[PDB]
């Protein structure tokens, strides 16, 4: 039985002595609500549909159906579209279904009912039902000709069904299609770091925490937490993401003004030694203290918490998002050198950082840290202890990245930052 | 509080690895700022520091706790571009190593991006930050100027055997030995410069073997330091055993 | 001066050159493979996002002379040659001669100072309204045409065409713009060159289908109508649509699916005769609607489709019954509905401007043919044709699509032969009747508007016939590295 | 011996590279026995060896699309092999592969016990077909061919329900493909280098059939895996990966000497003399292998100079250690643990490993070796380049295949994971020589390999 | 699973891993494996989880909880949780060496993760893997 305390974005106490078994993705009600909202919610770019109907550009990248432009007025009449799409997406009368128009009508947010999620085998019910409801509204209540209907449909859907993705469509949610899963249960890992930092309004404690929420829900869905491994994952979820006993924020406030990676390592090894987690196994010649782990899930929790703390200290110093290609790597490498114990995830997050450095600093097409998710082929290996740091780095940036939050995630950010349990993940998961 | 021991080993190369990780390095020579900026190569020497976004006091920051808790570097507070310094280190007893410069830059400097190749070692930071990091690397015993010379591309020579006067085989020569002391004119990028930068006198071969951080069967064999092989075996046994079952 | 066969030697439609049906297959004739190789090895990446990352994040000056340097660096680097100094292995020059890169811009002022040996200009390759449409479509943007080796795509697959591109793009930027050869700028450039600004004609397919991406299931009908450049060089819209019919029936019904009857959909001229008759019929009836022009078109109503499609099919039925010249093959009676449906579809699209009008004409054609003769194609023929008439003007999830975005990965069109080429021709005919510069993708009209291609995309059926009699030279052959 | 420049060894510049990947991508194996069970049970026709023979002359000459170009397509034939000698002799000697003839007695006994009494046909479609589009229509091509050959040879009409039952029993009931479909990003179809597992490439090469020294068999699979997986699936950058200048051979023979010195002959063939795999044994052999190779590099500086980049130093030390540990224990994951210990010992000895990402597969390497989590645990015989760790970056997979072969070659097994693949490529009529792959690239870099799939006869000069 | 462990035929059609035969009786004490797998699959005690044994102990029927369906985005976390629970029950009841853990794993999981499907693992659900869907929402119509 492990009983952590919970601290918020600013290191104030939220809920004390919580059992870390209650923080499970399969046991915590708030994580269940968060992932059901990620399943049931989808975003509509009404201005995108209007541009597709007018200019004829739809169905993918650099495509335009020329000659059949439909001069419609979607942004101006956005509110009536919102009640009409709410009428066609709901199952019963006002069950849990909401359609909210935002930002003066350029966008829509569609919450599918909870019943449609439990009526299908996965999460794409929300995407398909929302896209079809929008298509049916813009056809029936703006008066589309019989032969003009497929243009109005492919203004909303993409090249679907010819491409298995709605490519060029104006309807998408946070989760992508299940055919785009690298593994089994990877559906809660198709969530790029720009989406997480856009959702939490570029908070760095909150983006890391909510990516921990998504990553450990994905890990439990993989069947990678059964028996004692469940405790091994939940200890890291408490310590790294969910700010257990204020450890990460305490280390950051200790190493804010002058701190480097080395001072973060000194703080975590002092905390590990003084808490009785690790002890001196043997002492070599020249007095090199060889260390052993009394609790290996807890030592991995400390190495994960130190990984996120070192991400904070090494990215806030430069105000750059690119440092977590190397911050994770060299934190875990100096941590292996310092104690003799293996780093976080027994080298898995170090390997993830190794490959992340190569695709974020070379001719191989990886790009900036803003586009990396748990389903990415490079960063999938660590069991949810790497991508929180990537989302924190993206939220911590100050404009040195062109593949930025706004350009690839403005729609998702401005629609999903309207939800309280998405801007404030720790306060939801703690419950205060 | 916790006195970091940084590395295992009672040998000399364990001590030199600890000296490179800790930063308790002695200064052997001096490079001025005007020609150091010249040989970095991202700027006109003795000019204004450029920008890639407006400074943080002007364009503001989000409401972040990490931003309000981590004080950004002076080189980032002015919104400088992120530019780089990189080196190549010989395998014939160079004082530094591509990992161990990365360890040096990680422990001793705020907000850097150390990157280790087999022959390259890069530090990427803001302008005023990488200038200090490269300055501390160049003026100390950590860089032997005959051995650990600045390349920015076409870096071959980490594993190529040295010349008869103890310098790497460079396919484009930044650094030349003649006149006694080592001198260099170009930047790390392969473009020439008008000014000549003296570095200093190179270390001798025995002093290079004393100051190095490479286990070499010529000088300090890796096989005879059982203290560090025990470290490798312990961390590997822990990795394998806890990847089977973490108990 | 005597002889017997049991098979009719097919003359390629519109040409005097003739090939028996068992060397118009994609194994014997070489251009059948070469056109698909040119579809494979080609990808297009966009330069503006890469240029502005070089601009703001390095402080580097982007200018026409640096761009000329960057394209000469890339055009050296592309044929598998070393441009950044690591001791890499170079692909041999004699195996790799079909590699080049060429830009086209929406800004003519920028297009002037870039070296004309690396520029495909919109003005020199299009007419005035064509160029105005394409410059207005792509914006003032800079794109570039990537063509990787034919030997590389021939050896491994067509999914390496975007990856060899992004791997040899980034080395070119590094060598011509003096980056670090590995730093945080190169990731931005090479992710622009691989998933941000990359556009490729072949898309990904579901895993239940046992093929991969950049395979002709992903190549949409509008994409293939944009690949073939008959609309660029000729004015008669029926000729454009039937050239697309021939190219589609070759690349869709013979390669993407393996009794090889469907060669006859572009052989012996039945398809043409019917299309020229009903374009004359539309010009006589609907006040010259099917001539080139935008406002002369009739609105796509149901009765217009009914009249045009019914009249075209009764003309085809009367032609066949009057001279069953193309009949009497051992597995006869199929490729008898395909040509009638293609004629009716092109006829419906050339009058209305709507491609789904052409589809509805196609399915009306199959119904009229079936209930005139009491038989419809071979065994597996009217899965889609019996489905299709209700699937064209729908807007459901897996049903609603314009022809223009449709392709062989469409659910009805996945597994049956003899259908997709007529769909490509219909999607072309919807726009060639109004003289559009492009149908769906304006990038691929420009990208394949180039004469250095070993294939000739001006007339695909002329090239099929030209290769069918062995004066076509392909590109991906291992000429030197094998013994003699 | 005949070694040449690395320039004419790159895979596009080398014929035999291309022809062995074409041979692997054009071959499929189809089960034949339960189609005969359908024919016996509900077609009323008694299958005989004469009917089998007539089926073979129908199917072997039908490959070029007959009832394509006869001349172009020639590298096409269907052969049979059975694990049941009761009908293996009545079959014609021009369409049969005897497991007894091509193998030794105990290897053939293991093959027959693995497959039982079943009959399997080995199908090789033309190379031009596999070069035109991807090699994912080998299944569908051979499917239509064997369907046409049932309908022709056994005299049924087309279009019957019993013919439909035979149709499913023929081709999509027991189909053995080289690889399977691929996940999200690199979503290729079957019979691609991503799906070709390490046991499959161990079984495809046939040195285990024709040699008794497990070191040569292991290093042979190392060379074939390096070229195929790295250059084709991931390419390049010093492409001649660990099959030139024989440092890896020297380290492997030294390791066999060390194992047969310390342990009681544990590296020779036979499963009786195999030491059980503990961490101490892995640590001992892996550290001794790595320290020997490092001392060879640091002792001979010209070899430290010739391998100029750290990636190939790390790969040749790790592969030698991995094949050593696999021979000593008979366990393939022991070989993987030796590989990753060699990586870590090399890194700490020299303070430098590889090129930014040459350590992705290695830091999460040693921890994933003995795991039994879902996407983390797998025997090295079943692993391949589709494995989550090994998916995307060069320089590793060849040693990974050679380790699995070294495990199932140190104990003298007949096959690594498939006997169907082992017998299927045990026919010498292939253009490639799978018995000795690394000699064939010496022939393919000296312009002495004559592949098929060329289109010279149908194009002008 | 017992035949896979003793013979070595695991992870696909024709695959045989020789020399690593792990001789064990699984069908003889299938009740014990049943309560152990009920312990490892379940989220909490007395939930909507029931694994019951078939005649002769030759098979058992894992039903994952409703919460492991609610807490996952798709349907077949049940397959992975059941396969991992059976694998760890086999490991806990051998006392196997950890260098023979992967054999006892791929006897249950098949050739996954190398193959996109399990492909030979004895843990088998009714619906196919979500990557083996035809379109958006066709995973629930894959019952022959």
UniProtKB/TrEMBL annotation, chain B:
Could you tell me which Pfam families the record lists for this protein?
Answer: MCR_gamma
Q: Which of UniProt's keywords are assigned here? A: Methanogenesis, Transferase
Q: Please indicate which superkingdom the organism of origin belongs to.
A: Archaea
EC numbers:
2.8.4.1
| One GO molecular-function entry | coenzyme-B sulfoethylthiotransferase activity
Name the family. Answer: Belongs to the methyl-coenzyme M reductase gamma subunit family.
> Known NCBIfam families for this protein?
met_CoM_red_gam
What quaternary arrangement does the UniProt entry report? Hexamer of two alpha, two beta, and two gamma chains. MCR is a hexamer of two alpha, two beta, and two gamma chains, forming a dimer of heterotrimers.
What is this protein identified as? Methyl-coenzyme M reductase subunit gamma
Provenance organism: Methanosarcina acetivorans (strain ATCC 35395 / DSM 2834 / JCM 12185 / C2A)
Classification lineage = Archaea, Methanobacteriati, Methanobacteriota, Stenosarchaea group, Methanomicrobia
UniProtKB/TrEMBL annotation, chain E:
The region annotated as signal peptide is none
Query: Where do the Methyl-coenzyme M reductase beta subunit N-terminal domain residues begin and end?
Result: 1-135
For this chain, the family text in UniProt reads: Belongs to the methyl-coenzyme M reductase beta subunit family.
Subunit structure, briefly? MCR is a hexamer of two alpha, two beta, and two gamma chains, forming a dimer of heterotrimers.
- UniProt-recorded name of the protein: Methyl-coenzyme M reductase subunit beta
Describe which stretch of the whole protein the shown chain covers, with first residue, last residue and complete length. 50 to 193 of 434
């Amino acid at each position: 039985s492990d009983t952590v305390d919970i601290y918020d974005d600013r290191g104030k106490l939220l809920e004390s002595n919580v059992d870390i078994m209650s923080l499970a993705p399969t046991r915590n009600a708030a994580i269940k609500k968060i992932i059901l909202d990620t399943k049931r919610s989808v975003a509509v770019s009404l201005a995108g549909i209007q541009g597709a109907l007018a200019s004829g550009k739809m169905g993918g990248k650099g495509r335009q159906i020329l000659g059949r432009g439909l001069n419609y007025d979607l942004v101006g009449n956005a509110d009536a579209i919102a009640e009409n799409v709410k009428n066609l997406v709901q199952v019963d009368e006002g069950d849990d279904t909401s359609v909210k128009v935002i930002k003066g009508g350029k966008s829509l947010l569609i919450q599918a009912p909870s019943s449609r999620i439990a009526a299908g085998a996965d999460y794409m019910s929300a995407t398909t039902v929302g896209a079809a409801a929008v298509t049916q509204t813009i056809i029936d209540m703006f008066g589309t000709d019989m032969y003009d209907a497929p243009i109005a449909k492919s203004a909303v859907w993409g090249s679907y069904p010819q491409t298995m993705d709605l490519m060029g469509g104006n309807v998408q949610g946070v989760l992508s299609i299940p055919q785009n899963n690298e593994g089994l249960g990877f559906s809660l890992r198709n969530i790029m770091a720009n989406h997480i930092a856009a959702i939490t309004s570029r908070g760095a404690m909150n983006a890391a925490a909510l990516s921990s929420i998504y990553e450990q829900s994905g890990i439990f869905e993989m069947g990678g937490a059964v028996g004692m491994f469940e405790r091994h994952q939940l200890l890291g979820l408490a310590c790294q993401g969910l700010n257990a006993n204020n450890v990460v924020y305490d280390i950051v406030k200790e190493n804010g003004k002058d701190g480097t990676i080395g001072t973060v390592i000194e703080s975590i090894v002092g905390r590990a030694v003084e808490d009785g987690v690790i002890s001196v196994d043997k002492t070599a010649p020249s007095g090199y203290k060889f260390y052993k782990a009394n609790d290996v899930p807890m030592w991995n929790a400390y190495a994960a918490a130190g990984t996120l703390a070192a991400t904070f200290v090494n990215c806030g110093a430069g105000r750059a998002a690119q440092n977590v290609s190397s911050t994770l790597l060299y934190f875990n490498d100096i941590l292996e050198k310092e104690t003799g114990l293996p780093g976080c995830d027994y080298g898995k997050v170090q390997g993830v950082a190794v490959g992340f450095s190569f695709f974020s600093h070379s001719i191989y097409g990886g790009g900036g840290p803003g586009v990396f998710n748990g389903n990415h082929v490079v960063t999938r290996h660590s069991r949810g202890f790497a991508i929180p740091c990537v989302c924190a780095a993206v939220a911590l940036d100050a404009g040195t990245q062109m593949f930025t939050i706004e350009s690839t995630s403005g729609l998702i950010g401005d629609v999903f930052g309207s939800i309280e349990e998405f801007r404030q993940p720790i306060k939801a998961v703690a419950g205060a | 509080a916790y006195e970091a021991q940084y590395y295992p080993g009672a040998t000399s190369v364990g001590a030199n690895r600890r000296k490179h990780m800790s930063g308790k390095l002695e200064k052997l020579r001096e490079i001025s700022d005007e020609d150091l900026t010249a040989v970095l190569g991202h700027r006109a020497p003795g000019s204004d520091y450029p920008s890639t976004h407006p400074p943080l006091a002007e364009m503001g920051e989000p409401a972040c706790s990490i931003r309000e808790a981590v004080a950004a570097t002076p080189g980032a507070a002015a919104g400088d571009r992120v530019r780089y310094v990189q080196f190549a280190d010989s395998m014939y007893n160079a004082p530094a190593t591509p990992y161990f410069r990365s360890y040096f830059a990680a422990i001793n400097f705020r907000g850097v991006d150390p990157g280790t190749l087999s022959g390259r070692q890069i530090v990427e930071a803001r302008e005023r930050d990488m200038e200090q990091c490269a300055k501390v690397q160049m003026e100390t015993e950590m860089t032997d100027p005959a051995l650990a010379g600045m390349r920015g591309a076409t870096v071959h020579g980490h594993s190529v055997r040295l010349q008869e006067d103890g310098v790497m085989f460079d396919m484009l020569d930044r650094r030349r030995l003649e006149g006694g002391v080592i001198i260099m004119d170009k930047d790390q990028v392969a473009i020439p410069l008008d000014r000549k930068v003296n570095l200093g006198k190179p270390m001798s071969s025995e002093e290079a073997a004393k100051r190095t951080t490479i286990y070499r069967v010529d000088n300090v064999a890796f096989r005879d330091d059982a203290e560090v092989i025990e470290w490798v075996h312990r961390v590997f046994d822990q990795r394998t055993s806890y990847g089977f079952q973490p108990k | 001066p005597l002889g017997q066969r049991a098979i009719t030697p097919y003359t390629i439609s519109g040409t005097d050159i003739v090939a028996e049906p068992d060397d118009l297959h994609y194994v014997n004739n070489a251009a059948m493979q070469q056109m698909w190789d040119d579809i494979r090895r080609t990808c297009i990446v966009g330069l503006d996002m890469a240029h502005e990352t070089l601009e703001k994040r390095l402080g580097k000056e982007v200018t026409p002379e640096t761009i000329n340097h960057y394209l000469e660096t890339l055009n050296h680097a592309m044929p598998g040659a070393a441009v950044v100094q690591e001791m890499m292995v170079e692909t041999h020059p004699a195996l790799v001669d079909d590699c080049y890169v060429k830009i086209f811009t929406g800004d003519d002022e920028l297009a002037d100072e870039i070296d004309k040996q690396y520029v495909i200009n919109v003005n020199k390759m299009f007419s005035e309204e064509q160029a105005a449409q394409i410059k207005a479509s792509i914006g003032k943007t800079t794109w570039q045409a990537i063509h990787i080796p034919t030997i590389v795509s021939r050896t491994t697959d067509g999914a390496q065409t975007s990856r060899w591109a992004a791997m040899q793009i980034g080395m070119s930027f590094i060598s011509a713009y003096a980056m670090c050869a590995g730093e945080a700028a190169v990731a931005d450039l090479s992710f622009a060159a691989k998933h941000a600004a990359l556009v490729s004609m072949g898309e990904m397919l579901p895993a239940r289908r046992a093929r991969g991406p950049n395979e002709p299931g992903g190549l949409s009908f509008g994409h293939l109508s944009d690949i073939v450049q008959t609309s660029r060089v000729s004015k008669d819209p029926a000729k454009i649509a039937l050239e697309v019919v021939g190219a589609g029936c070759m690349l869709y019904d013979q390669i993407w699916l393996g009794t090889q009857y469907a060669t006859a959909a572009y052989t012996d001229d039945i398809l043409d005769n019917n299309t020229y008759y009903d374009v004359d019929y539309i010009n006589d009836k609907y006040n010259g609607a099917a001539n080139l022009g935008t406002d002369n078109k009739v609105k796509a109503t149901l009765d217009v489709v009914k009249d045009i499609a019914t009249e075209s099919t009764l003309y085809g039925i009367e032609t066949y019954e009057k001279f069953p010249t193309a009949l009497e093959d051992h597995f006869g009676g199929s490729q008898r509905a395909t040509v009638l449906a293609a004629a009716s579809g092109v006829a419906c699209a050339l009058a209305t401007g709507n491609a789904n009008a052409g589809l509805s004409g196609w399915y009306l054609s199959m119904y009229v043919h079936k209930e005139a003769w009491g038989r419809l194609g071979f065994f597996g023929f009217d899965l889609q044709d019996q489905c299709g008439a209700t699937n064209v003007l729908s807007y459901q999830g897996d049903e609603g699509l314009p022809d223009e975005l449709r392709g062989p990965n469409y659910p009805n069109y996945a597994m049956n032969v003899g259908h997709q080429g007529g769909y490509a021709g219909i999607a072309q005919a919807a726009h060639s009747g109004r003289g559009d510069a492009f149908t769906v993708n304006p990038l691929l009209k420009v990208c394949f508007a180039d004469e250095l291609m070993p294939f000739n995309f001006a007339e695909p059926r002329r090239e099929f016939g030209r290769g069918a009699i062995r004066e076509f030279m392909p590109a991906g052959e291992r000429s030197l590295v094998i013994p003699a």
